[PDB]
Amino acid sequence: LGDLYEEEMRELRRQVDQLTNDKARVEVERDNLAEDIMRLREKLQEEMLQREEAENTLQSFRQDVDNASLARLDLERKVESLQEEIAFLKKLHEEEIQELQAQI
Amino acid sequence: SRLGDLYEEEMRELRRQVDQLTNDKARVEVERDNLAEDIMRLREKLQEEMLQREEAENTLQSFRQDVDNASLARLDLERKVESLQEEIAFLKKLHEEEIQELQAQI
């Protein structure tokens, strides 16, 4: 009867209400994750700039470390060189004077 | 004697909402899913940048130490180069005088 219409409409008004509360529920979830995603992308755009700057500094600083290391080697050698010269002087001085006990 | 018309209109407007809502909601679910996904992918990226960056800062702090240890060792060597240059000149002078002491022996 007129009953089928009321029953087919009881059914529909029910679905529309389910779906309406669900579309509501899911909209809230999305609105939420959309905030998180914004907070995050920023915190990350941030870290990127720090990480990058950090690596850049470390790039031209490797040069400085190399150069300081070599400057210290260039001296460790200048010194060793002076020592071989002094070690020779003495071999020579010492000799250059035995050659005057002959010819006293 | 028509009641079909009493409902035909109110009914087609419900069965239409049901279809709209269904579509509307299905689309909000894709976005919401995408978000969950994007967030997770961002977080993994975050850890990876923090990691990389802490590695660059640690490495550069070690290099700072290195450079500071070379400086103190350079000043040292520069002195020991001076001292050795003086010891050579002195060594020489002493010897020249010592062979000049052996000149009176003629």
> Out of B25, B73, B88, whose CB is closest to A82?
B88
- Number of structural domains (chain A) is 1
Contact A72, B74 (CB under 8 A): yes
> Out of A13, A36, A47, whose CB is closest to B46?
A47
H/E element, B87: helix B14-100
Contact B42, A40 (CB under 8 A): yes
Judged by DSSP in three states, B106 sits in coil
3-state DSSP of chain A? CHHHHHHHHHHHHHHHHHHHHHHHHHHHHHHHHHHHHHHHHHHHHHHHHHHHHHHHHHHHHHHHHHHHHHHHHHHHHHHHHHHHHHHHHHHHHHHHHHCCCCCC
- The C-alpha angle B93, B94, B99, rounded to 5 degrees, equals 95
Discontinuities after residues in chain B (C–N over 2.5 A): none
Residue whose tokens read 């994007």: B38
Residue of chain B whose alpha carbon sits nearest to that of A96: B99
Residue of chain B whose alpha carbon sits nearest to that of A53: B53
State both tokens at B16: 């239409």
Report the C-alpha gap between B48 and A21 in whole angstroms: 40
Q: What is the resolution of this structure in A?
A: 2.8
**Which domain covers residue A58, as residue numbers?**
1-104
Residue B101 — φ and ψ, nearest 5°?
-75, -20
Judged by DSSP in three states, B101 sits in coil
H/E element, B17: helix B14-100
Contacts of B73 in chain A (CB under 8 A): 72
> How was it solved?
X-ray
Contacts of B81 in chain A (CB under 8 A): 75, 78-79, 82
Closest residue by Cα to residue A46 from B92, B18, B45, B58: B45
Contacts of B36 in chain A (CB under 8 A): 33
Residue whose tokens read 């010891």: B87
Amino acid in the structure at residue A72: R
Contact A35, B38 (CB under 8 A): no
Contacts of A42 in chain B (CB under 8 A): none
Closest residue by Cα to residue B77 from A33, A56, A36, A83: A83
State both tokens at B67: 């450079």
